[PDB]
Amino acid sequence: RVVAHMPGDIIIGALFSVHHQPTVDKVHERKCGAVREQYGIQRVEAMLHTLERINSDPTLLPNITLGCEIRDSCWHSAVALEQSIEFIRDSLKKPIVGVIGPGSSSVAIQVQNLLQLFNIPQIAYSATSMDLSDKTLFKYFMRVVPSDAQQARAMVDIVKRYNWTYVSAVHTEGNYGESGMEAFKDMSAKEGICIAHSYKIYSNAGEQSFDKLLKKLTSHLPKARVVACFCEGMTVRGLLMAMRRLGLAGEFLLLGSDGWADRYDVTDGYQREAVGGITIKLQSPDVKWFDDYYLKLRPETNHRNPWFQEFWQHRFQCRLEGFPQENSKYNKTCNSSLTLKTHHVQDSKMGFVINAIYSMAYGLHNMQMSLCPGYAGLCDAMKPIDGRKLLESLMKTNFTGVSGDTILFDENGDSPGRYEIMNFKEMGKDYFDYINVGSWDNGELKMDDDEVWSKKSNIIRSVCSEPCEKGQIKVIRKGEVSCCWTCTPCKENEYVFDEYTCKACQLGSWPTDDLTGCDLIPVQYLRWGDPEPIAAVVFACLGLLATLFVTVVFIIYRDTPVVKSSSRELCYIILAGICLGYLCTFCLIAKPKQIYCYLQRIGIGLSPAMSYSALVTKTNRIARILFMSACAQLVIAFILICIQLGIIVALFIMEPPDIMHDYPSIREVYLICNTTNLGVVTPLGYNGLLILSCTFYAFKTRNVPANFNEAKYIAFTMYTTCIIWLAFVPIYFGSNYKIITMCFSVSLSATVALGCMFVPKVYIILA
Amino acid sequence: RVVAHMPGDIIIGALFSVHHQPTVDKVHERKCGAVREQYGIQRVEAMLHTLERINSDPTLLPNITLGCEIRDSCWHSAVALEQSIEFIRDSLKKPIVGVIGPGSSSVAIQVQNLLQLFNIPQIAYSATSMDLSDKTLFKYFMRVVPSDAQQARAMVDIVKRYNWTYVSAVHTEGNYGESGMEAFKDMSAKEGICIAHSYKIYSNAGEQSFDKLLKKLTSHLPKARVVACFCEGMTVRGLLMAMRRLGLAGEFLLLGSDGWADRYDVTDGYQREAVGGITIKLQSPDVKWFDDYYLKLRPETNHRNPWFQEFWQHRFQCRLEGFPQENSKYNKTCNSSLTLKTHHVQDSKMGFVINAIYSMAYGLHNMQMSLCPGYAGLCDAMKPIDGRKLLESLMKTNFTGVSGDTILFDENGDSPGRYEIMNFKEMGKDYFDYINVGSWDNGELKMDDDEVWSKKSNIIRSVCSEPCEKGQIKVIRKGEVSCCWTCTPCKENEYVFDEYTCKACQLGSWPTDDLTGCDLIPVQYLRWGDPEPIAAVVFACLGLLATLFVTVVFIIYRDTPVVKSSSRELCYIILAGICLGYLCTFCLIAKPKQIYCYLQRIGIGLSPAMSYSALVTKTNRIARILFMSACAQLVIAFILICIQLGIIVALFIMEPPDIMHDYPSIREVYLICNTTNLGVVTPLGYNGLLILSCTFYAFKTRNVPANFNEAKYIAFTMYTTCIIWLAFVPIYFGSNYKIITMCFSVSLSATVALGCMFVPKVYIILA
Ligand SMILES: N#Cc1cccc(C(=O)Nc2cc(-c3ccccc3)nn2-c2ccccc2)c1
Ligand SMILES: N#Cc1cccc(C(=O)Nc2cc(-c3ccccc3)nn2-c2ccccc2)c1
Secondary structure, rough: OOEEEEOEEEEEEEEEOOOOOOOOHHHOOOOOEOOOOOOOOHHHHHHHEEEEEEEOOOOOOOOEEEEEEEOOOOOHHHHHHHOOOOOOHOOOOOOOEEEEEOOOOHHHHHHHHHHHHHHHOOOEEEOOOOOOHOOOOOOOOOOOOOOOOOHHHHHHHHHHHOOOEEEEOOOOHHHHHHHHHHHHHHHHHHHHHHEEOOOOOOOOOHHHHHHHHHHHHHHHOOOOOOEEEEEOOHHHHHHHHHHHOOOOOOOOEEEEEEOOOOOHHHHHOOOOOOOOOEEEOOOOOOHOOOHHOOOOOOOOOOOOOHHHHHHHHHHHEEEEEOOOOOOOOOOOOOOOOOOOOOOOOOOHHHHHHHHHHHHHHHHHHHHHHOOOOOOOOHHHHHHOOOOOHHHHHHHHEEEEOOOOEEEEEEOOOOOOOOEEEEEEEEOEEEEOEOOOOEEEEOOOEEEEEHOOOOOHHHHHOOOOOOOOOOOEEEEEEOOOOOOEEEEEEEOOOOOEEOOOEEEEEEOOOOEOOOOOOOOOOOOOOOOOOOOOHHHHHHOOOEEEEHHHHHHHHHHHHOOOOHHHOOOOOHHHHHHHHHHHOOOHHHHHOOOOHHHHHHHHHHHHHHHHHHHHHHHHHHHHHHHOOOOOOOOHHHHHHHHHOOOOOOOHHHHHHHOOOOOOEEOOOOOOEEEEEEOHHHHHHHHHHHHHHHHHHHHHHHHHHHOOOOOHHHHHHHHHHHHHHHHHHHHHHHHOEEEEEEEEHHHHHHHHHHHHHHHHOHHHHHHOOOO | OOOOEEEOOEEEEEEEEEEOOOOOOOOOOOOOOEOEEEEOHHHHHHHHHHHHHHHHHOOOOOOOOOEEEEEEEOOOHHHHHEEEEHHHHHHHOEEEEEEEOOOOOOHHHHHHHHHHOOOEEEEEEOOOOHHOOOOOOOOEEEEEOOOOOOHHHHHHHHHHHHOOOEEEEOOOOOOOHHHHHHHHHHHOOOOOOEEEEOOOOOOOOOOOHHHHHHHHHHHHOOOOEEEEEOOOOOOHHHHHHHHHHHOOOOOOOEEEEEEEEOOOOOOOOOOOOOOOOOEEEEOOOOOHHHHHHHOOHHHHOOOOOOHHHHHHHHHOOOOOOOOOOOOOOOEEEEOOOOOOOOOOOOOOOHHHHHHHHHHHHHHHHHHHHHHHOOOOOOOOOOOOOOHHHHHHHHHEEEEEEEOOOOEEOOOOOOOOOEEEEEOOOOOOOOOOEEEOOOOEEEOOOEEOOOHHHHOHHHHOOOOOOOEEEEEOEEEEOOOOOOOEEEEEEEOOOOOOOOOOOEEEEEOOEEEEEOOOEEEEEEOOOOOOOHHHHHHHHHHHHHOOOOOHHHHHHHHHHOOHHHHHHOHHHHHHHHHHHHHHHHHOOOHOOOOHHHHHHHHHHHHHHHHHHHHHHHHHHHHHHHHOOOOOOOOHHHHHHHHHHHHHHHHHHHHHHHHOOOOOEEEOOOOOOOEEEEOOOOHHHHHHHHHHHHHHHHHHHHHHHHOOHHHHHHHHHHHHHHHHHHHHHHHHHEEEHOOOHHHHHHHHHHHHHHHHHHHHOOOOHHHHHHO
């Protein structure tokens, strides 16, 4: 082979792909193919001129002359891996200190696995694999270009900015697409972004495969209107060609990496279906001072580049007469007026090639400054140059590049990313072009929203499920994507706990209007203003007036013959019973409390006993005439009263008094005291016997004219008492109006008893 | 440097460490040190003679001549890594096809990382790392020696054979010790073997460290009496020296790998504390035909070994006058009678060095036979020889070695292990030596137990905790080793479920004598043979005889004046009541069943009512004289009887009859029918009133001479009935003898009632 030398004191090695890689037939015999234009001569000339310029600089590396050795790589593993052997021989002729290259991202791994055994640092300018960031295996590798995990960050930032949350996924097969898509998925899963379904395809498959791809991506509209493509430059062309035939154009929004960034050869002839796509590029401004040097070169005055003459002949398709490398293949002869300005195109990677050399030079300068202080040249303590301190000098380099940007390496030897953002939209009648609409600068996304969309309302939307609403909980099924839910309402009984669940609050409570917390329903019970309680009260007042008049009459005229005929003490007992019958409505109708309920359950069982005991003993004595002392009768009446009171006390002991809350319905809550069925039924059963005996005896002795026909009135009264007790059961145990009916029943029975027994007596004594 | 050539058609490369590794001062300038004896010249001569022999063999590789190239390695990475570069350069002078070596186990990795980039297979004969078994990283590596995970298998087999289950652990720091101990732990954990505590130490630490190691290992006796050392040859010497001063000798049993296998320089001066140790060696019989060739060599007639003259001068410490490599350092001149037979020692690794060459030759022969069939030589389809088919030809080699053993490679390119087993025991008065006591041959441990231990009872034991016993469960504290448990007994109420837990069976059951399954206790209840039931039965029979006699007398003499004076029907009723009182003991004393308990609860409540009703109505009529028809009295008695039967039926409805199992104590189970307190107390309360009325009226009318002083006997009878009712309560409700006492009470009361009421009547009527 041929190697390009340049003398000096410190030697640098470079591997540049000047020719095409050998075909499969000549892999074992090499024989590289055709010469390259962009990658072949421009890089070699740039390195030579950069070294000349850095030597002419008196500020950097004073009195030290740097050299170089440039070798071919042919974009093939074998050739580079042989030239590396040739380098490491001379290392063991000054030794090589560092290597710049190679271009490929898979040759570099095989060259590193060889160069790290002999402690040689390596810097690459176009290798962007994600496997090269592991410093356990690749300890001597550094690069000035962003990794493949920086595009997956800009893509996530762009998606996050525009509020997209349900997208597709396409990627080619290989290390590039697979690693990029893995990074994209890992970064997007942390920002609440979900993928419909990830796909996979070659870059040269058949039309049937592309049609099936379209049919499988069409089965998600209109839920996933954005496609996240991390594919190469031909998968996009295949997708556009497939879209053309099915008539699906003007519907999708393809978001792609820099495989399809600014290449016109991807959308030629298919500009109608690619409108709207957003792509990211790699920022790289041109280098001004390289053109003023590259164009002045002439074949007759270029001797340090052995590849120059064949390059000239290939480019101009002619033959150079009188030259050491004349070729007989070309019949035409070159003219003396030929020049290189004709269709001159600058290389698209000319910045990193210079930045790598500058980084290595700065590392050497720092090592010399920190190792040979106070001296200008090669001090005795730095001969020869060891490759273990240079690796630590290089990692801490930090300077400014050719374009005013900052160059620095992190702990992994990587570099920060800087990307542009383009947009393919129609300019006019049959005219399409890319235009810059933003940039990404290591965390700061600066994008012009006005230019991308003509109107705000025209923004494409892609969301799976609409958000919930006023009082709408989230219900999610099993096996589905986390961002495809359903909104359902809680019932009126239960409020909403959080975004995910309802919650049912305890009885007696009710959710508020905001559905944030159940509040307590105020207790509701009877009211004085209702006509029924006031009617009961006025009835009771009339009854008290009547009984007061009757007792006043009897007290005033206690010596009358009528009073002498009857029994005074028994009449007083009956009057007291009637008064206590009247005076239970005030206790009953009031708001329930501690002792009020006890008084109401005591009076209802006491009042129907004291009067009826005396009345039954009187009627029993009268029937016996047809133990005659009044003291015995009073003792018997008091004994029966005591028995009734003992029964009442036993009922009290069985169930102690208490206040109770009623829950008839969810909406309303009442307030009724402790009142069971037993404590009411038992006194009724006990007092039924007395009235039954009274009725029997009154029927037996209903035809005696004693005491102005007293027996007739005594027999006629009982009918009402018995019929009232009878009617008191059904409607008491058949509705929710217990208080009013049990307040009217006792009063009505007492008033009929008082009006059918004593009214004739007072009427007769009056006149 | 210098390389040893040998011509031919196929070239093989070898790396042999002829010199000592350069010191730290000359690492960058090489300058290897002193010449080696075993590793330097013997291996080179063996390879040369082996190639000569295989060329002379007409049945292997016909008409093809093999060659070789031997280079130094100096046991250093740099020198071998330069000679490998020289090899792979000439591969790109016939190319090298394979490399044998190097000796070291860490240089080999660095040489493999270089040789696998250019597709060169490699075979090693003394590298035994466990990192070289990964074919993802080391695809071109093969070896004929067992890995370091084969000693960890023989150790586990030896420990498992002798029933040791609690051992210590010691290992030196490095790849060797750490990897071996990791393998040992992983293999031992699967066979129920536990480690007390693993340790770790240098091989050159201070005396204080070794003393601390002894003090930390002394804190486990006598539970861990076996130490599993996987350390190098100097850690054992340090342990012995440390044991010497503390006077701990003659106690331990050191089990070690082949770092301390047969080396006398480890137990010299300390044979007293190393007695009993068991070590494993590597099987390697000597090669006979190498000695007949190596000894005949002379310095004057050896020209193909450039290292020979310096070797001779170094070995004999003289100067070879008149030689191309004469040295002036040695003043003494060599003698013509010198020979190599003096102190000749064979290399200890001479078998694998030949087996590797034979394996490579067999691989080449197989590839030639399978690629150019029907031809004898180099066919046109095998020029040049590719290194990708040789790697697959080599992996399937399977043949017989020099010592009659089988050589084959598994999928990882490894080899099976074959080890010996030694023993360091005293032979006599101040004499110690190693003796073979077994072997391990890839799964078959053949070890002579009789020679290791003089007597069977002298076997050293090492177990943490004794096993459980006849009915003992396992309880293990938290945080302790799984093989250190406690054996505890279940109580008498529970049996043992499994080896780990007890279990308590249900009530009425009992664990058996074997403590494997709870069995049911047979039901136990009353017995006829007991004196109490038969006494009750004979008492009842006597009562039946008496009542039969009385009723026969009354039936025969129904027309007597005495019978006319009394009431016949009431007397018959009383007789029937007494009969039903007697005939409750037969129902009661029998084994409980469905209806027997119903009859016993019916008779006890019926008998004390139907007689006493008639008696009380008779006495009431007699007291009233001082409704006289007998029909009214009979109707009243029958009405009271019906009321009693109604109460009985109500009690029956309250609690339906049933059979019940009693559980007074865990050991015994009874059988008593359903009998609550209410069903017994209620009839007694009901029938107390009748007897109270009877006794009150009898006391009221106890002085009437009617009917031969019948009132006196009627008043005297009641006393006994009342007293028996009274006595029946305390002891009935105060012991577990309910049946006997309630059987005697009714019978006694009926007997006294029948004997104090009718006996005088029959006595008078008789005479
Ligand atoms: N047989 C029978 C039978 C069946 C049911 C009930 C009653 C009864 O006791 N009626 C009654 C009589 C009196 C009474 C008291 C004092 C003065 C005049 C009358 N008040 N009450 C009464 C009791 C409870 C609720 C309503 C009313 C008897
Ligand atoms: N006051 C009072 C009072 C208090 C407790 C118990 C009894 C009572 O009923 N005694 C009794 C009388 C007779 C009886 C029956 C028929 C013929 C002769 C005697 N048998 N029994 C009896 C009942 C239950 C268990 C044991 C014995 C009365």
